[PDB]
């Protein structure tokens with residue numbers, strides 16, 4: 044495994060390359076998490092080792108969200124959702140990549156989608172989780188946005204290992220985002236839309252599917268999830284990823 | 296004057312820093328470069344005062360600068376959107392914070408897309424013959440901005456690369472609609488300039504209908520049938536004077 048900081052258009056982004064003619068899997072997490080909180084559980088599951096063995100994986104920590112990140116200056120003009128997507132091309136450029144298979148959650152899904160829409164030749168397909176195309180302690184907000192031994196473990200990592208000021212900026216940015224202007228101008232690659240039943244973001248994920256092409260977009264509403272697919276049922280999701288990548292011309 | 300190549304997100308862009316608080320960033324139209332498109336304005340006499348007080352940065356789109364090597368065959372030329380993602384890197388190279396943009400046809404579209412993505416880096420935009428929607432080389436160019444000219448026709452042939460120009464033009468025509476509606480719209484003052492009896496009067500007005508009028512002003516030049524900077528640069532040099540004043544700078 045190797046980690047690095049990539050100087051991009053709008054500051055640095057921490058990345059974690061970890062894996063083996065095949066696109067690279069680029070992940071972008073949600074607000075309130077980093078790549079360890081959001082994907083390390085998923086990508087260490089057994090039904091994913093095969094992907095990990097056949098594919099290269101690149102985990103992107105949004106600006107200031109990596110473990111033990113220094114606070115940005117006061118008044119920092121934090122990159123908007125659009126500005127966060129313009130940073131992705133530089134990632135590929137740093138490793139001589141040509142295309143990636145993106146996987147995003149909450150804010151990551153929005154960013155990756157905006158990045159596919161700007162540079163569609165660099166994206167083979169997107170896995171979008173809980174995407175939304177539109178006086179509380181921070182650990183309370185985070186838990187209340189995406190929702191047990193899990194809840195406390197996430198509140199516990201948010202506090203000790205992450206920076207409160209940086210997280211505020213990132214969250215304040217995602218909420219001032221604009222609508223993806225998409226019409227069934229739309230995605231030019233296959234999409235995998237994943238949400239759980241009785242989950243906070245079902246209507247939002249369904250609204251995004253209504254504006255996408257059904258020929259190459261598939262919806263998957265897991266029954267016993269109601270929150271984050273990689274938390275509730277990562278196993279069922281690890282196979283969902285298998286079937287999506289296969290259809291494009293790649294081997295799990 | 297000093298010129299440089301700026302390595303950006305999507306390859307290099309040639310720039311020409313030349314001047315002396317915001318910086319004036321210029322972007323040309325299809326069929327031109329900064330010499331064909333802005334040198335008339337910025338060497339005009341009624342503009343010297345601006346030239347004296349401001350720093351100017353002229354951007355030549357990839358492959359449009361004088362004597363540019365041909366891109367490889369099959370080159371995926373940056374789209375209009377990808378051409379806007381390149382501008383932040385320009386400011387980043389010279390420690391800039393905001394600029395006053397001036398664009399023409401394709402330049403106006405690019406800068407507008409750049410202001411919409413990074414509105415804190417633009418104090419105001421001068422958009423000329425902007426369109427927010429979608430044969431020998433010199434003839435193609437002339438029919439886009441007119442409906443003596445020979446000075447432009449000869450420069451297309453002798454001084455610039457024909458293949459690069461094709462790619463640039465092929466991109467401008469595959470552009471999409473700007474996500475703008477008068478109340479998601481521009482968050483800075485805009486100066487929309489088009490001539491009377493000009494190919495892009497209806498299009499330039501369509502852009503103003505989607506902009507905020509409190510800070511947007513439209514300008515229909517009376518006897519301008521092509522490029523405002525060619526026909527009546529004086530009328531435009533005074534329009535530019537007043538635009539910068541209203542923002543808090545003393546041209």
Ligand SMILES: [Cl-]
Pocket residue numbers: 508511512513
């Ligand atoms: Cl007006």
